[PDB]
Chains A and B, each alone.
Chain A
Amino acid sequence: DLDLLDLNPRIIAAIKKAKLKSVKEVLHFSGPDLKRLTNLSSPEVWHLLRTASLHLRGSSILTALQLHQQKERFPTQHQRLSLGCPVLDALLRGGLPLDGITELAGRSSAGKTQLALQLCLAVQFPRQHGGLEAGAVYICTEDAFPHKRLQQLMAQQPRLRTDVPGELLQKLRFGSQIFIEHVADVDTLLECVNKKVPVLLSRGMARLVVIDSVAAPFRCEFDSQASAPRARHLQSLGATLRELSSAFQSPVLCINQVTEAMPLGFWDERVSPALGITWANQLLVRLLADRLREEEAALGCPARTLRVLSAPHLPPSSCSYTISAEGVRGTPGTQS
């Protein structure tokens, strides 16, 4: 790759003597390191850096007008993934973005796994109905997969999704396009996300990744006195997930647990996301499914609320929803 550059043979010979391979590891080093290794003066080092940088990044120029006008060339800025419920889609103004990590947080019985299953069902709908015509990847880190709930959801799919024409759903084979994986350790999860998910995404089998819990493996090994390795692992995992999502234009959804609050935007709230600010820096859209059980429970029905914590384009708001035999349904006319 080095010989592709337009440069005099002297610097090419010096680079070859310096044990260099490609432009990436040329840009990896700095000025004084290159001076020490290659024994070159400043002007030619600057020229080599300039040429390698020009080759790597090309010479194209992009404006925001092109991003706005040309919808088809840039689907990431316009294409969204539906949640299967019009109320939830209205709350999210279309659904999940294709680039970046989305997080669900909440206590037990909030309804996170039901939403994950519903999204895994609706991802493979046709394009005009919000789907992506692709499979899904499901990773479990805490317990077994909800098989009966999945079977009921596939059975009820004609009842839940009524806008889609009836003659179109029978051709959709649901269970055959969902992949299930299971891990039991932080190292196992790292190896899985490193060398299994890219294989699935490369062949076009799936275009959606769901992790049923990221806090579960981490809350078992690292104590309160080992924050540095925990932060290193969290940063590596977030970087890899973001790289994969950007490369393959596939949404990533993470399910998270909560802790007890005993400066970060949480004052009038008793629970906060578990991992901390290090993991919170890696995210794009943050939601919070919450169930108010201690109060307004004597009315006979649970009170479930989904709230948008932060997003670059979504105002803080919340809506209400219920879980029934066919799936998750949002209550009309309740957006904050």
Chain B
Amino acid sequence: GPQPISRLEQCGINANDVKKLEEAGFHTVEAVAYAPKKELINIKGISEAKADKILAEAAKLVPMGFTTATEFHQRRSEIIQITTGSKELDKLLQGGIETGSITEMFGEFRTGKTQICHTLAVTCQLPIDRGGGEGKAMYIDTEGTFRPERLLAVAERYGLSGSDVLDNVAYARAFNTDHQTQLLYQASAMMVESRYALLIVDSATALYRTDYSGRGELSARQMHLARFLRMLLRLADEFGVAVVITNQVVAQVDGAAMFAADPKKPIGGNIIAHASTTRLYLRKGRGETRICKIYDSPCLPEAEAMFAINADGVGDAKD
């Protein structure tokens, strides 16, 4: 059961300190042992040495090894946010693409997913103060639409060296789902050696459309997709990198529009709907302007922003 603070008396403290702790709402050994340092060093009638020895003597009884919300929010300033190259998108995302999570972007054709991936593959190499992540990038490609010339065009904008930028990007091509899953082991092996800040899969569901066909193969497809996403989550958690994946869309032909023009929803179903942390839905505007919307996020309200695709990558709409 609970251990009252009466044991502190035989542990080597006077009655004044335990009386003050009782008057401060502390009434058990466990609460004092797991209390944050500031909470019992900012109180009246205490000293730094007294608090340190109190923690040392309390840790003996209560078994330590449990994380607490304060000891979790204080340690997470490590989370870096990578700028997307557009001020509007950075403002919408409140900093940019977070690390240690999975971000998904889906939409129809020419919406700008590949362009955003290309821009991020360069922006992730900037110094932290400039908005980058100070690392390299991986690009796993399943469609064959990787263009280094866009990388060079983006690099010229920030005044970087083209040769170095092209040197600091790794590339692999996946020809089926088994190869796609197999590449992640080598991805981890290579992340061990060096410092990577980003991993990109484009697309994460293109090959599942045709590798498993019909209603008679849905279950195996979903199981394979779930295993792949679990591997991605393990990689992101272990190495503290940012994972960005893309997705396709499907039509709703059941006649359930009711003033909803040309409805469409992402493929992959509940498995990919649950695995991802932040989901972005890309649309098209007039000319070269696009609209980005927040589809799902644990800590962000739903809003919209407008960006554009220029000759130097993703940026802001000109006037």
Contact = CB atoms under 8 A, between A and B. Distances in A.
Interface of A: 107-109, 113, 142-152, 171, 173-181, 184, 199-200, 202-205, 213, 216, 219-220, 223-224, 257-260, 262, 294-295, 297-298, 302, 325
B236 to A, nearest CB: 9
21 contacts: A143-B101, A149-B298, A150-B69, A152-B299, A175-B69, A176-B68, A179-B68, A180-B69, A180-B72, A200-B66, A203-B2, A203-B62, A204-B1, A204-B2, A204-B28, A219-B271, A220-B230, A224-B219, A257-B270, A262-B215, A295-B258
Contacts of A325: 301
A143 B277 contact: yes
B53 interface: no
Contacts of B277: 143-144
Nearest to A138: B69
B299 A148 contact: yes
Nearest to B29: A203
A108 B30 contact: no
B274 A108 contact: yes
A195 to B, nearest CB: 12
B260 A178 contact: no
Contact of B298 (A146, A171, A199, A204): A146
A108 B234 contact: no
B67 interface: yes
A175 B70 contact: yes
A219 B34 CA distance: 35
B275 to A, nearest CB: 7
Interface of B: 1-3, 25, 28, 30-31, 34-36, 39, 62-63, 66-70, 72-73, 76, 100-102, 215, 219-220, 223, 226-227, 230, 233-234, 237, 252, 256, 258-260, 263, 269-271, 273-275, 277, 295-296, 298-299, 301-302
Which 6 interchain pairs have the tightest Cβ spacing?
A175-B69, A204-B2, A108-B273, A148-B299, A146-B298, A178-B69
Contacts of B258: 295
Contacts of B219: 223-224
A220 B226 contact: yes
A302 B100 CA distance: 29
B300 to A, nearest CB: 9
A142 B274 contact: yes
B254 to A, nearest CB: 10
Contact of B3 (A200, A203, A294): A203
B299 A149 contact: yes
Given A180-B67, A180-B72, A204 B30 contact: yes
A294 B256 contact: yes
Given A203-B2, A224-B219, A294-B256, A184 B67 contact: no
Which of A199, A200, A294, A297 counts the most B-chain CB atoms under 10 A from its CB?
A: A294
A220 B222 CA distance: 9
Contacts of B260: 294-295, 297-298
A144 B39 contact: no
